[PDB]
């Protein structure tokens, strides 16, 4: 209706106010005058709505034939005013009851995302509900699944292309990847009568992602975030199997997490291989057995290969670094924490892989062989492919090698922590930074004469073969057909050895990083809780101790060492770092033995220390146990047990005889002797030490752990059990 618009503009230009507004207001200033409003917006819309619904005609009618279809009155109910026509809510009800019937094609199309949400809910299975501690971590996660996801700017450009191609402006190159998609969308909306802005927000709903910080526990995929409110609380878990289809990447990540957890649980057990097989055979990744998932997916990590070998499968030595697949050829690497100085000047803690390793590298179509050494990229033999893919593969290989030039090539701003202070994987951040600014990386790397061999030629930073090429990279004409195997036998300790006997993998190579699986992981075993986090394991172990408190105490008084061996304590041992497990065991065993033999028994301390007595004892060279003020456990700085005072994981109130474990309150009433209130805690805090009397000022200040450890037997010392309560002890 171009002519109608021209006539409307001509008529509007007659008004002097309108003419001056049009002439003086810039296109930028339109955004100002669009919001012009002489009156303030009323506040408290809830009260305004409750008040207005009691009015007679609180609703505005759109003038037209359809408004005229509404009768003036209906059975003594006035629906519309007889300026701006207003109607009652009864008018809306009348329209819904007797109004014209319309075609609902638009609603079905505009809200397709919500219909997919409903279908995903409907084609879902519900498992059991379990009651128990659930440790949740706050992570930035995706709210709703999207088939294709792009950042908001790209999505806005694509939407402008689809819906408003004329007034779209510069053809940003970033839209290239999506050009085909645009055509497809322009196919579906060619003859739609829906208002364009609604279609634009439909497309945003389909393309733009919404990511929010939410508390999650073991299921971070958007299909699960949709049901998060029903998935779990703080004290219960609800097994859920969403409908639809799940990506292969999610399955691979979830199986990696499951295998790492299985290995961590199994290593501390006797015969770790048998326990690992037993757990793996009962592990389900969402709704599929772990063995089947390992058989299907072509990838994983060290833990996945170890679990494959334990199950009789074939190890796939594939690794993923974001954009490229790396298949091991030879060599074994070890990861070490080291403070590396980045080009920007800020020292960052990074895991550096030592040793010499060979990898079949694949990126898109480009293939190659990468020879890497500690902190140095030795060589990279590549085949001719797309120049763009070739350079992405080259930079990915250089960053993957952790070369000194790569680190020194950083010039700008790199964030290794998110706004919440959570640690982002440094190597992926470096990869992302160098992906879009490869110019500085190539400039820093250096160049050298291109090889003059018959089949070897170099490549320069100009993405073309030339007489100059960056150090290390060599092109070859020897076509390679990608990766398309080794045979190993898994030993008792979950170490993979070839026919020659050399260890190629082991349980000590498994990453210790605790991560949230994208897909819900289930263990169809009564001891599933043993695969939980540190806090869940601690709470479950202490609850088990409390449940069997009477029998445990009886066995302790009668028995000597058979009480220290239990499967619950075996699971507890997996969250103790292996370095301190023996020392903690020796300390706790000595403390409990002295509590028993000397007849000064404290139930709270006995319960606190019993789980730590599982590992084989590890005393000092002189035959005495190590002394500790707190026993540290894996993960977080708040995961520790205080020997003397209370701890975030364990505290005891003698007044109410209440034990607080990981925030849960339990009662020791009945399972307690009131005489234990008069009993001294100083007899249950140091191995080989017994309270000798009141705090003597002669001895001086309170001694420390190392000072206590060097005391001769039969020697006194002043000890501060906790604030406002000193005591003196003797050996």
């Amino acid at each position: 209706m171009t002519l109608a618009k021209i006539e409307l503009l001509k008529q509007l230009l007659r008004d002097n106010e309108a003419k001056t507004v049009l002439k003086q207001t810039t296109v930028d200033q339109y955004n100002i005058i669009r919001k012009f409003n002489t009156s303030r917006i009323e506040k408290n819309p809830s009260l305004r709505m409750k008040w207005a619904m009691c009015s007679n005609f609180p609703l505005a009618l759109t003038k037209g034939d359809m408004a005229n279809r509404i009768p003036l009155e209906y059975k003594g109910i006035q629906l519309k005013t007889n300026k701006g026509q207003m109607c009652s809510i009864a008018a809306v009800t009348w329209w819904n009851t007797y109004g014209p019937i319309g075609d609902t094609e638009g609603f079905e199309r505009v809200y397709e995302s919500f219909f997919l949400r409903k279908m995903r809910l409907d084609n879902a299975t519900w498992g059991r509900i379990t009651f128990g501690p659930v440790e949740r971590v706050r992570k930035r996660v995706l709210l709703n699944p999207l088939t294709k996801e792009m950042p908001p700017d790209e999505a806005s450009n694509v939407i402008m292309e689809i819906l408003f191609p004329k007034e779209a402006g510069i053809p940003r190159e970033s839209t290239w990847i999506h050009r085909e998609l645009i055509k497809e969308k322009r196919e579906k909306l060619k003859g739609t009568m829906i208002t364009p802005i609604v279609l634009a927000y439909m497309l945003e709903r389909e393309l733009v992602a919404r990511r929010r910080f939410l508390p999650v526990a073991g299921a971070t995929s958007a299909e699960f975030i949709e049901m998060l409110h029903c998935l779990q609380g703080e004290n219960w878990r609800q097994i859920y199997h969403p409908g639809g289809n799940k990506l292969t990447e999610s399955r691979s990540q979830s199986m990696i997490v499951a295998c790492r957890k299985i290995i961590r649980r199994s290593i501390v057990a006797s015969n770790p291989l048998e326990l690992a097989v037993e757990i793996a055979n009962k592990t389900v990744i969402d709704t599929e057995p772990l063995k089947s998932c390992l058989a299907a997916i072509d990838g994983g990590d060290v833990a996945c290969d170890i679990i494959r070998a334990a199950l009789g499968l074939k190890i796939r030595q594939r690794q993923r670094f974001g954009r490229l697949e790396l298949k091991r050829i030879s060599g074994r690497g070890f990861k070490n924490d080291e403070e590396i100085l980045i080009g920007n000047g800020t020292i960052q803690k990074i895991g550096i892989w030592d040793g010499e390793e060979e990898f079949h590298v694949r990126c898109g179509e480009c293939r190659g062989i990468l020879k890497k050494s500690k902190m140095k990229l030795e060589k990279l033999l590549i085949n001719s492919a797309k120049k763009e893919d070739m350079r992405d593969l080259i930079i990915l290989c250089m960053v993957f090698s952790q070369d000194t030039r790569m680190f020194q090539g950083v010039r700008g701003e790199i964030n290794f922590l998110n706004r919440a202070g959570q640690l982002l994987s440094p190597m992926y951040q470096l990869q992302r930074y160098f992906l879009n600014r490869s110019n500085d990386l190539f400039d820093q790397w250096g160049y050298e004469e291109s090889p003059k061999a018959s089949e070897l030629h170099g490549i320069n930073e100009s993405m073309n073969a030339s007489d100059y090429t960056l150090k290390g990279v060599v092109v070859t004409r020897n076509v390679i057909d990608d990766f398309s195997t080794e045979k190993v036998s898994i030993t008792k300790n979950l170490s993979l050895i070839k026919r020659t006997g050399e260890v190629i993998m082991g349980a000590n190579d498994v990453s210790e990083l605790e991560s949230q699986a994208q897909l819900m992981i289930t263990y169809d075993t009564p001891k599933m809780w043993e695969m939980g986090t540190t806090k869940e394991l601690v709470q479950n172990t202490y609850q088990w101790v409390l449940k069997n408190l009477v029998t445990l105490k009886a066995q302790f008084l009668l028995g000597k060492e058979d009480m220290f061996q239990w499967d619950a304590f075996e699971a507890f041992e997996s969250i103790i770092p292996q370095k301190m497990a023996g020392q903690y065991s020796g300390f706790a065993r000595a403390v409990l033995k002295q509590m028993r033999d000397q007849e000064v028994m404290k139930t709270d301390q006995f319960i606190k220390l019993l789980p730590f007595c599982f590992s084989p004892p590890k005393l000092r060279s002189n035959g005495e146990p190590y002394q500790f003020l707190k026993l540290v456990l894996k993960g977080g700085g708040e995961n520790f047990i205080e020997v003397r005072k209370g701890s975030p994981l364990f505290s005891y109130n003698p007044q109410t005889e209440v034990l607080t474990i990981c925030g849960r309150m339990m009662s020791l009433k009945g399972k307690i002797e009131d005489e234990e209130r008069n009993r001294s805690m100083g007899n249950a805090v140091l191995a080989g030490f017994l309270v000798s009397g009141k705090y003597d000022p002669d001895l001086g200040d309170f001694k420390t752990i190392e000072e206590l450890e060097k005391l001769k037997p039969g020697e006194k010392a002043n000890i501060l059990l906790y604030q406002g309560k000193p005591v003196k002890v003797v050996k």
Binding site: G127, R128, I129, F131, C230, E234, N235, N653, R664, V727
Partner: protein
């Protein structure tokens, strides 16, 4: 520079740390104990524990508030036809003759065959609603010239002492009755096991709350505020009789329409959110106002008849009071059901904790116990200076009553008291955990607490309860001071 400036800064500039002890925590608001002050009077918008509802069997047909009131009054014709008043108590500035005339006009209008609840603007109605009481606005110049025009001295809320009726109301509102007032609508069927768990838990929780007197009082408040807002919007320039009504269900499933009294709405031209509409309330009761006259300074009470509940008949008095409300209060009264949530969410949390410790749903065990666990019990109150225990449901009802009172008696005094006393509660918790709390200006914190205890009955009773609980906590801590010592 910082070191140099701190060197020359006076030692008087100090945070003055002081280690907190149980003996340093004194009772809050001692003035609530001195008998010089008057005991805090009853000021709630409606009777709660003294309410008396005339019950009429219904057929599930919510005809109309006017028809419901007319039928209820027809059932109790003796009360309806009582024409000669016997004054029992009189408010200081009330005209009992005008109030009785207004009550009779309300009864006649409700009982007439006409379908309208409008009242004429008569002399007694105009006095009761406060007609023509707004000051005339004059020009600035004349006012400045006029030397008699002065800024009014603000009226401050007065200071009152503890009144036993607040404790009585707390005791009676949290007791179980035989009537259900909650009208919770249906939800969708349960499919997921978590939904079935939620339904099973809702059974216990709602059955506990739905039968307590506080639920009926809350429903009366909600329904009356809804009706009042609708009438205020619909009838701005008319006096309307608004029956105070409820619908209850017996344990046998039979429903009753309950009429607790009648209200007269004055002119409602509420432009602002704080603008006041006057409401004159006439509420039936069985309580004799003379038993504790200090509770009813604001009420003009007539004795209008008698009723039979057992072999002993009970008197029926009419409590008449001029009151006011605004749109904010009417809106927040329509949504008082949220009290439920605040009571439920807390108690449910406790149950969940127990579940995590036992590995199975603990709702039934908490409420009534089971084979392996005894019912969970809470310190609920005092009886002759000794701590008394109560069931999980009793504690739930107490928390629900507390939230309902937060709504009923909530104002700025309650808000400030809650914040400052929360600070004090955190300090007390630190003491209980043996965390060795330290303070800097404890008297300042106490003064901040006590600045808010003037005339809010709930705040005064809360200060009394806080002092009692603090004494019990000191007694309990006396045993915790001799461990390994």
């Amino acid at each position: 520079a910082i070191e140099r400036n701190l060197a020359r800064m006076s030692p008087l500039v100090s945070v003055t740390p002081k280690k907190l002890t149980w003996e340093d925590l004194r009772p809050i608001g001692p003035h609530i104990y001195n008998h010089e002050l008057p005991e805090v009077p009853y000021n709630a918008f409606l009777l709660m524990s003294d309410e008396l509802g005339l019950a009429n069997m219904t057929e599930g047909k919510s005809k109309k508030p006017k028809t419901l009131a007319k039928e209820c009054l027809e059932k109790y014709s003796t009360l309806r036809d009582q024409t000669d008043p016997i004054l029992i108590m009189k408010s200081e500035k009330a005209n009992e003759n005008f109030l009785w005339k207004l009550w009779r006009d309300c009864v006649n209008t409700i009982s007439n065959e006409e379908m309208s609840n409008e009242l004429q603007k008569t002399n007694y109605a105009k006095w009761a609603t406060g007609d023509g009481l707004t000051y005339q606005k004059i020009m600035k110049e004349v006012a400045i010239d006029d030397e008699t025009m002065c800024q009014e001295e603000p009226k401050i809320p007065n200071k009152c002492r503890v009144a036993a009726w607040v404790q009585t109301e707390m005791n009676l509102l949290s007791t179980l009755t035989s009537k259900r007032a909650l009208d919770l609508p249906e939800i969708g069927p349960d499919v997921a096991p978590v939904e079935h768990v939620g339904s099973e838990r809702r059974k216990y929780f709602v059955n506990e709350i739905n039968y307590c007197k506080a639920s009926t009082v809350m429903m009366k408040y909600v329904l009356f505020h809804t009706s009042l807002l609708n009438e205020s919007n619909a009838s701005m320039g008319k006096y309307k009789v608004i029956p105070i009504t409820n619908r209850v269900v017996n344990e046998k499933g039979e429903s009753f329409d309950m009429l607790y009294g009648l209200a007269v709405k004055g002119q409602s031209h509420l432009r602002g959110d704080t603008d006041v509409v006057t409401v004159v309330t006439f509420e039936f009761s069985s309580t004799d106002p003379r038993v504790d006259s200090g509770k009813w300074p604001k009420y003009t009470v007539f004795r209008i008849g008698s009723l039979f509940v057992s072999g002993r008949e009970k008197s029926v008095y009419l409590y008449c009071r001029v009151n006011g409300t605004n749109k904010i209060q009417m809106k927040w009264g329509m949504e008082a059901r949220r009290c439920l949530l605040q009571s439920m969410q807390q108690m449910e949390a406790i149950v969940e904790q127990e579940s995590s410790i036992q590995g199975y749903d603990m709702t039934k065990a908490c409420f009534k116990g089971d084979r392996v666990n005894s019912p969970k019990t809470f310190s609920i109150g005092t009886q002759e200076g000794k701590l008394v225990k109560g069931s999980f449901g009793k504690a739930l009802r107490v928390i629900f009553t507390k939230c309902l009172m937060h709504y009923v008696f909530g104002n700025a005094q309650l808000e400030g008291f809650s914040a400052e006393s929360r600070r004090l509660l955190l300090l007390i918790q630190a003491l209980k955990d043996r965390k060795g709390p330290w303070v800097f200006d404890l008297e300042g914190m106490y003064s901040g607490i006590e600045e808010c205890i003037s005339n809010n009955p709930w705040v005064i009773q809360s200060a009394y309860w806080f002092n009692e609980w603090l004494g019990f906590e000191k007694e309990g801590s006396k045993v915790l001071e001799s461990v390994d010592e």
